[PDB]
Design a protein around this ligand. Structure first.
Ligand code: HEM
Ligand code: HEM
Ligand code: HEM
Ligand code: HEM
Lengths: 146, 141, 141, 146
């Protein structure tokens, strides 16, 4: 994938003000609530019985931070997103058996969440930059199939 | 399908948008065209440049239609079927495209009214967006 | 929607199927676990080896439910409410998985009834298969 | 992407035996018939007014056979799809702007077209060989994004 320079800078500046824990818990809570089947992969987490249960849950919040953090690894390495996610991909495809459509789903949610914390600051060029980033991370993870 | 609790959520957030239906309409469409450039291919006759006014009044139509389905939210399919013919048959629009617009509608909702796209709202909202997508893609399935 | 030609095309073929019911179900299942391995993880408890007594058993039960809604092809959603709770809420099946099963069962028909499976006939079945999925995923939209 | 021997054998073998022009035509017609929005891409094929018309169009069959010929290309080169479908990649993505998800649909349909023309000889083991083939192929056309 080829990164424009205007694009590197749009992903890079936004990134630098993201509260990873705030968006993390949120991305992930919304993934569980909005696409309820993803709940299955996360059942080790305890009570996911209602929406409130879900935004109530410590692990949901805590694992949200972990995720967003892993986005950081890509933003650190836009030219090597391929190998950043290569161990994360084994786990997601092999072990946990996640359908790659779900990464698309979390990347779309991610973007709704960044919209909502950054307002007019989450510019049309800027959203196009991010949609491509999450597109990429997702294919990065999805490598381990085809 | 759309439960009672969804239909409030939807109704509620629409009450809160309403005013801005033309601006949201147009930012929705602009963002779709910068983010999903293959989508322009269907508007070959538009001034697709920022600000254009065909965008402005197309995006008025878009969300007015949606606003409309919201008031007869009980029978969306009935309400919107005038738009299938055109979308499915005439324009032959790829179903992917509806998720796309739909996603950009949610982003516009989120920049202006983030406090209201609560996650429980977001979900009612996506169900509704699918329902719409489904009726315009209709007379395929 | 489901066109009365659709409702027709469908019947045509469920009646070619019929009492190959149980054989066809087993086979659709087998192709689904061998072609889409991750689908076996919903079956942690079954004997999944080619031939298996339970797979046969289960297979019949799927195709049965399928033949059952072909008998209310008019109100599928209702002929089948009972199973959405299962799939959607207890089991949390990912919708993608319904297209997988859907596809293995077209393959099965195609192997055993090629003649019967004409493009048009193939279209109607698809829409069918689609509705079923939608219903079975219904406590999701 | 790693191909076991059985997978190569199973693909190569069956391939041998394919009527490129009939399945090539059948595949293509099922597409336009089953997924009617696909018709928008083919209006330079004249009359697609109905299934029977789609079914008979000399240009559709004409094309049917081009497509499936190309799968053959794939078969000849399993370890090396990614490069073989670079140019068909630009065509489909930059020129025509075809959503990738319709590659999967086609693969899917190809597969029901083999099954109908091979019956029992299209064993489960065989179908998987091929699902992977078709899938590998539609990631190689959808490279030219992300
Ligand atoms: C989309 C971008 C994604 C990224 C960046 C990502 C990243 C991560 C990271 C960094 C970990 C844990 C490493 C560890 O603590 O072992 C993790 C684990 C996990 N992920 Fe993801 N992941 C992504 C999407 C998903 C998706 C869709 C799912 C599935 C619905 C998912 C389900 C899981 C589960 C079930 C674990 C194990 C949780 C546990 O530790 O108990 N990940 N991921
Ligand atoms: C929720 C989704 C949509 C709604 C509610 C919607 C609404 C409408 C309405 C009301 C019109 C016509 C107003 C009139 O009759 O002049 C229209 C036309 C049109 N729509 Fe959609 N549309 C939707 C989705 C899409 C998508 C995703 C696309 C493209 C991807 C699209 C492309 C078009 C085009 C090209 C026209 C023709 C208008 C012209 O030529 O000026 N629509 N749509
Ligand atoms: C054509 C769509 C489907 C139909 C018509 C169908 C039909 C049925 C029926 C009738 C039963 C339960 C019989 C009983 O009450 O014991 C059932 C159970 C079950 N179904 Fe499905 N199903 C469909 C799709 C799928 C898919 C894709 C999966 C997952 C891969 C799935 C997974 C299951 C599971 C795991 C059970 C539990 C059965 C047991 O443990 O005994 N279903 N299905
Ligand atoms: C699925 C894997 C696919 C393969 C291997 C494939 C292959 C090809 C080939 C080999 C050609 C001719 C190259 C040339 O002569 O320059 C071609 C042209 C074309 N294909 Fe595809 N294609 C695929 C998917 C699709 C899909 C899904 C569509 C529609 C949704 C599509 C539409 C077209 C069109 C519209 C043309 C050229 C128009 C013309 O030149 O007459 N293709 N494709």
């Amino acid at each position: 994938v080829h990164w424009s320079a205007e694009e590197k800078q749009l992903i890079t500046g936004l990134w630098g003000k993201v509260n990873v824990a705030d968006c993390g818990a949120e991305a992930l809570a919304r993934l569980l609530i909005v696409y309820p089947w993803t709940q299955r992969f996360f059942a080790s987490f305890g009570n996911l019985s209602s929406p409130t249960a879900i935004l109530g849950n410590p692990m949901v919040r805590a694992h949200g931070k972990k995720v967003l953090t892993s986005f950081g690894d890509a933003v650190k390495n836009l030219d090597n997103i391929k190998n950043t996610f290569s161990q994360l991909s084994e786990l997601h495809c092999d072990k946990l058996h996640v359908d790659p459509e779900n990464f698309r789903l979390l990347g779309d949610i991610l973007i709704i969440v960044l919209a909502a914390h950054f307002s007019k600051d989450f510019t049309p060029e800027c959203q196009a930059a991010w949609q491509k980033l999450v597109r990429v991370v997702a294919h990065a993870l999805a490598r381990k199939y085809h | 399908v759309l439960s009672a609790a969804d239909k409030n959520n939807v109704k509620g957030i629409f009450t809160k948008i309403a005013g801005h239906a033309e601006e949201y309409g147009a930012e929705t469409l602009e963002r779709m065209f910068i983010t999903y450039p293959p989508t322009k291919t269907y508007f070959p006759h538009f001034d697709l440049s920022h600000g254009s006014a065909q965008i402005k009044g197309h995006g008025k139509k878009v969300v007015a239609a949606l606003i409309e389905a919201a008031n007869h939210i009980d029978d969306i399919a009935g309400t919107l079927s005038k738009l299938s013919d055109l979308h499915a048959h005439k324009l032959r629009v790829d179903p992917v495209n509806f998720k796309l617009l739909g996603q950009c509608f949610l982003v516009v909702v989120a920049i202006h009214h983030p406090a209201a796209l609560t996650p429980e709202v977001h979900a009612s909202l996506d169900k509704f967006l699918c329902a719409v997508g489904t009726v315009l893609t209709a007379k395929y399935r």
